[PDB]
Fold Palmitoleoyl-protein carboxylesterase NOTUM.
Amino acid sequence: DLRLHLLLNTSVTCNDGSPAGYYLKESRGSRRWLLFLEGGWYCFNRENCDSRYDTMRRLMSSRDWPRTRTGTGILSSQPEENPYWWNANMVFIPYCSSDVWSGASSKSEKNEYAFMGALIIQEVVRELLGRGLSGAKVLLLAGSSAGGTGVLLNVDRVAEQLEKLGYPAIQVRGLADSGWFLDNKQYRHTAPTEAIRRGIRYWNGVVPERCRRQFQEGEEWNCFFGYKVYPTLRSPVFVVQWLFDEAQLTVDNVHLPVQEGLRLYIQNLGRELRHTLKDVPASFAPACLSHEIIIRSHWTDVQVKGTSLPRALHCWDRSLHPLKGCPVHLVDSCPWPHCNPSCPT
Ligand SMILES: COc1ccc2[nH]cc(CCNC(C)=O)c2c1
Ligand SMILES: COc1ccc2[nH]cc(CCNC(C)=O)c2c1
Ligand SMILES: *[C@@H]1O[C@H](CO)[C@@H](O)[C@H](O)[C@H]1NC(C)=O
């Protein structure tokens, strides 16, 4: 169980103005710190945020959060469940800003909602430095789905914050799970790129500086797509992505007797995802239809080329000190979902 702490700076808020916060379980024998960003889609205008407030209020407000949370998967403290980092200090940061962790906007007379995801991360990091983070050797910023994209948008900002605060010994790294999407041609029409474009204006969203300077004013939506923002990052980042991600297929208007047109569409999607990962040295991408993995209790079960994800992350740790029998780049080459026998059922 991790215990809830509301932010002492109560001007850093969830969408409705309630204070944001974090759940913490300390491990006093450890110099490793894991900060996990929750996911949960987003909203991008008044009407669609109003509907989210009716039926997804815990993703917009802290008024109804519980005092504790159980750590699962990579957040578990049991070695049987978490072979990688069971002895680490564990932090779960709830997602209550609906902005893919990019916002820097307060509630005001002109703004019904606050969008402060980027500021929430920096305030958590600050307040944690007085609870033991000042002694850390490694800070791993991790996250799933919207939180995985949040890692890509924020890991370099955390690194810069700690250097300017006077903590150059802390090594900042990122782990992005299920947040690596393609701005591809859809199977049918009914678009995420335009929703993100409008969202950035609504949230006053911020993106990493080198990416912003490449794409320039008006085109910051490009930095929400992993294969475009990743080459601009300086911190080491490990990318986890199912080749046939369910959220990707949903926005592509695919719902699973598959005939030739859809077969070719699905096979081309896996090929394109594989291609975007060829220059990503630390990555784990199985040929499965699924979504998210790192906080699932059975995350230890899936393997690529005989190597589990906990093992791949351990090999990554060793590489940041070409290891024999300890690989870090693991991408499936077979072309259809569940061609890998370790895929979840
Ligand atoms: C799950 O919601 C998210 C989270 C992070 C994201 N980054 C970029 C996009 C838009 C394209 N992908 C989808 C699923 O629409 C996005 C959506
Ligand atoms: C590749 O062909 C095209 C052509 C025109 C387009 N407009 C917008 C998109 C991106 C659509 N994908 C998602 C997931 O948002 C697009 C793609
Ligand atoms: C609280 O957070 C806000 C938003 O980042 C910041 O402007 C302010 O300086 C913070 N308060 C203190 C006392 O540092």
